[model samples]
Target: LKAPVVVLGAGLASVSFVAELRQAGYQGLITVVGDEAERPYDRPPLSKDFMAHGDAEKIRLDCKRAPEVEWLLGVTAQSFDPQAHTVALSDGRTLPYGTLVLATGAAPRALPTLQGATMPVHTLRTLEDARRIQAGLRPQSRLLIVGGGVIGLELAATARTAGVHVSLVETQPRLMSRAAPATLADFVARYHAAQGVDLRFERSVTGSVDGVVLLDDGTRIAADMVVVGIGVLANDALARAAGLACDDGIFVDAYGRTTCPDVYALGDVTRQRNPLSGRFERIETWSNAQNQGIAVARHLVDPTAPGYAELPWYWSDQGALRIQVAGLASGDEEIVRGEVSLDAPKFTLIELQKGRIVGATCVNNARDFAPLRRLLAVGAKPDRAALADPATDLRKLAAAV
Candidate 1:
């Protein structure tokens, strides 16, 4: 293991791995190759704060004190050979690795129908994309956002706040179709509508014309710009080409070990197993990328270390609301603990299976959510009546358990 350890991308996951490796006392030679010229930065802000502040330097991941790793920016991985343990770069160079980390990350899914259209269509993935989209957010600007996912909703909220007219079109009846529960999605839908965003549900963007988006129902909406956030496709082409096992995302174990020897993957690129669900899932949340990356680095430093099996958690700040969720959304039953009304200051939703708490979603109640989250981690189940009472102190309940 004397050869240089090579990391494929310079995103959060890759940076976390390098940082953790240094903290774990691994001073081996490390090289990182990223296709983007810009230094690694926080991506979540690109949708929320970056649009308002337009500060590129604020979101950069602090790598100044990181271990000495050779960074090859603005370089693409043309190909790799798992057997030979080598990666060929776009700059006509081959690099050998003792351990290879595939953190290539994912790319935003494109709308093929909008291909070659004359109108301004964009996808928010990189800093350049965010900058281009932010430029279009002006007073009286007509914005047509395609997708009801987190990215689209965040951008819509940002645009609407900036006096931009926004219309969001979604194929599903609810917002955050795959991310949020039904209750949370309904709340988000109403919230956006109240914010003066034209929320179009159960509608698809068929195509685009000259500064207009044509819907599947034959309705036409004029727009100064369009942003698509349908989803993302894993950047697993290099790993797939190298004969590693991949299905939509490259398969990796809890320790981030791929099927191939000495080849590991982390972040959005790896479809690792859900500890609670026992199913492989490509978790694109920031926590997964950061924590899993660090966990994998720890394992690389000490083979006898525990495998990474942390419960999944994600948080999104949508305007005035802060939504935090832990574990899987769907379960045997959904227990509503607090007031489900819109004006309720705080609310909590718990998912239970076999009468054991498996998941929880907290809206504006970080205090209660903290203890409930800990209970979920240990599969604890409190009295049903007590758990449903908003007056019940979650900390006390957790201590009692």
Candidate 2:
């Protein structure tokens, strides 16, 4: 019997792909296989809302406005049979694929070098992880996070508010060392420091053992619980085993098409090229996953449709401060904009690249962010002359504004 157009790994992207496929009028039989028994739901909440408040209900990723597809839950895809176009499962079952869609996503990178590891050393990547970590949260518990990245810092912020003693270690010089700009990281560092978090920069975590963090500075920090959110390793084992081009992730074109015919990958698993930046990147944010899934869905239904352009975006929540960043920023880049300070937490900053508005990070300035997002929707570069004046309204630059 011929196999269905199987969408593997029912994370946020895979589910969205199935929905988009149906929405785009694909009549082929579609099946989604997921390791998680729970329905696909929003993952961002697991780190922020769920981690902070122990809210399990919000952990599920639901669009609340999409069609459902055939689901195979609680089963792992063990291997890929490229010749037969089928996926072998750990349960000795095989699922045929007319067109395979890989959306296995990413996992939080763990520091295996940590010595004397104990029960308190943790990593949060899913609803279960959040649930496990949340249960461990106690008033004023000593919590040491091993990375200054978003997940680590975000959880640190939450733990501090809950009266937990927090310490963060980063091998790099600043927060979000690989993902955000220096100015932005500086702002975030200052803000978190003000919030009662112990921010350690340029500090290497040699190892961890029995709830203690060993820093490169030869200092040991005692901790009741330790969390690590250093980075991510793409879920590309199956793709690699299938002899697909797997670098940082499963290699794909701008259209999310892989080297193998009739096989596509999207979201964190696919290192798709950016049409705007001319750089290939594997996106790990909520918006990018859904958008790429839609793009792959369209490509599946009709290959003639347009593809993704890497207009990446992500946000971080801490107390009353809401940081929304659009476009990707280089680590060493300098940012120029208004006097928007995270310490004050009441404005927006339009990041400038050689005097042109390349990106922005808005904190509590919802008005500016809305217009900025709108202008971005049109995919137009901001006029340098217009952005130079503080008196210039951002809305004026957009056609709709």
lDDT of 2 by residue, 1-401 (tens): 12378877888898778788878878668777788777777777766777777766666666433454678888888888888888897668888887888899987787876645764777888888888788888897888888887778778877887788888888888888765656677888888888888888888878766667788898888888888888889999888988889887999886778888777899988787654356877777778888898887876677688776647778887665677787656422333556746546676656554444456677776667767766655555566656556777777666444
Question: Best-fitting candidate, measured by lDDT?
Answer: 1
lDDT of 1: 0.88
- Model 2 RMSD vs true structure: 2.6
Badly placed stretches (over 4 Å) of model 1 are none
> Which candidate's TM-score is highest?
1
Candidate 2 to truth, TM? 0.92
**Stretches of candidate 2 above 4 Å error?**
1-3, 63-68, 330-337, 342-344, 354-356, 373-385
- TM-score, per-candidate, Cα-based: 0.97, 0.92
Per-candidate Cα lDDT values, in order, are: 0.88, 0.76
Compared with the true structure, model 1 gives a TM-score of 0.97
